[PDB]
């Protein structure tokens, strides 16, 4: 019984690698964007790594929010 | 039991591979637009810098948060 | 039974890691076009940040009601 | 018996997951081609918010629809 | 002969979710096209809300055709 | 032999959510486009959208043209 | 015997279900691309449009072929 | 072993259903420039059309080759 | 042992169906391009047509090559 | 027995399908590039057609060298 | 077991085919452009040529690269 | 069952290297991109080629970070 | 045993047909860029192409990293 | 035993032949962007292919180090 329950586990852990990819794909996204906007004007200069970059960090939280319910399985 | 249990363990690593690759791509699209955003503008970083630093945490953060889940199980 | 349930929890586990790419997607692209659309001028994030949330909510949504059919499977 | 329609149950929830990650990409898009569309707009913006509901609506809609089929599969 | 009927209505339940996939991507894409196309055109705009709903609906609308064969099975 | 007969119906039926993705892609993106032009300028009034339902229409026929072929194994 | 057989006429039905994707693709195209023509142009609509129904016929036409190849085998 | 073989053409006859859709979404996509190009100009129609035909033509070709094969095998 | 080389044969034809696809495209690719290129002017067509038919037949070249290897697997 | 190699030949067949597909897209992308290269200029061709021809066969070529291998294992 | 070595060497054979048509996609791509480069007339006269061999001769070369594989089997 | 199990790692092992190719792309693009912004802009933009060690970097580090986390489990 | 073996050789072999597709698209891009840079100066540039030994290299070293497991297996 | 993990490592092998695939994708990309920024300056001269070196190494790099992966299951 213990047998499946572990493939279960082991699976799950698996498959919070498989998110993790849509993971930081978006985040790169973000920054890259953001730090364009600086260029242009000096209160620019900075600001979407700065903040829009921000919400990329957020989704590498919630990433490891799955790395979570991945060991959470096991 | 234990044939059942370690392929459980084997592909819940094989999908943290996958992760890293999705991952992997975010971050490289953010850097690229930096360049360009950098290229523009050589005073106005440091704001820029700021925010890039914010986005490339987040994205780093949630990927050893995975790892983590990873190992957690173990 | 426990066999059946088992598979069950595992697969829930691993078509969460479905939802993010989806959603890791999309807020990235917020993110990016938000530093950016602040950039030109100050009051940025102003009635437009206003439409943010609520697309950034109808998103969140729809990748809640994900997460919850993977909760509620539990 | 209650073995197959378990994992029926199941199945026909876990495609409640597949659901989100179509529909949470094309919100993302939406939001990201409105904000810069907002940042052009001044005096006209705002009946525009009015559309913006009328979809944001409708994508939400589906996506719950899902999120329904996803619990009642409990 | 249940366990058959089961994965039966299991799959066509799962196949709603697909659906939701796709519609899902659409509607973000009229919203989009939509506030963008708004902003440019005052003495125009606003006639355009119209178009938004016109496909804001289009898209939640496959989205619980899916939904709908999904609850159809049960 | 109905329960084998069962699931072929079943995941026939699924496979026609399949092709209700691809469709359900392009629908939304001649709608979006078209709300931006009919916006801009008004010259001759009911001309466009009158194609722009054409074809809607040929698009959504199409995929029921598939949902009558699921139904009509039954 | 039959039962074989049968599932196999099932299954041949619901990969005619695959062409709708791809079918459905080109279609919204021309749509698109036709609506925003039409808007530079008045010319184009109640008469450019009138070639579209040449397309937007060609399409919903190679759908049918494909429902013709659905029953063809019966 | 009929009944296998059988079912080996049913299939192989309905998934030459599937390759349609692959080639509908690239056929759209020559038709919508073409409807564009000629918007511009009175000498596409009579000449640019000439050229919608020919894919026009191109793309209802291999539905049918599809739906051939279809019956090829009945 | 017919039934199980006709089998072989089947699924060898199907993926001829595979080849179809992206030849299928190229071919649609020279061709939506040149509608365009002529829609420009009337006078210029005669050195371009040249390649045109060069690269239209490759294309379609590659196609029949498969066809060719569908059937003499039979 | 015969089975076997029958699906020897099968697959032998098949994944010189899968070739087409990659295949299709770069030829169809070179003569797209002529046609409108040709749209451009009208007199300067002959230089040109003349690598049309070098890639319309190096792409004709391919495709066939595929359908080979296909009916080369016949 | 001959019979299931067999079968081996015959799918590793297939993809070469497979191999073919990614290689397909990146040649047809430099000849386009090289198509196009050369009308411009920038690198048009004396240079559209010698580049497009270099990347004509590198994709025939990953795909022979395969045919040499599927040779090296038999 | 050590014979399984071990298998089971070795292909695990095996699709980690699956991942890393996409990777590679990823640093590939912000480098090229970097190249070219720093050959257009002014003053020396030093900092530029200092971002493409930045994002060369995260990149390969990811890529390693799996490849550590398929030999962790050895 | 040897049966097995022999299945690891005839895979082992095949997925190093996988990096032929990597590869091929990969260099593609390179040259693509590279063959545009040269039409814009003759005499001016041509960093790119330096570059290009930099890059032509890292592509044929995973590249003929699979040409060694290819040979290996020999 | 031994048959089993024997086929494991040679797959294990293989699909490190894949990760190639993605890698040759980004390389590239790097070189392509680089080869363009050189052509702009001849200020972007001699420093410009300084970094396309380190790049180009860097990815061959990686692709060994695959390579090594593929070898050392061996």
């Known amino acids: 019984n213990p047998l ?5 586990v082991i699976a ?8 993790s990819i849509g993971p930081g794909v978006g985040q790169g996204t973000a ?13 620019a200069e900075g600001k979407i790594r700065g903040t829009l970059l921000l919400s990329l960090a957020f989704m590498e939280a919630l ?12």
């Open 4 to 8: 499946i329950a572990a493939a279960s």
């Open 63 to 74: 990433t490891i929010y799955g790395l979570v319910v991945a060991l959470a399985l096991l």
């Open 12 to 19: 799950a852990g698996l498959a919070v690698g498989l998110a």
């Open 31 to 43: 920054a890259g964007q953001a730090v364009e906007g600086i260029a242009r004007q000096p209160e």
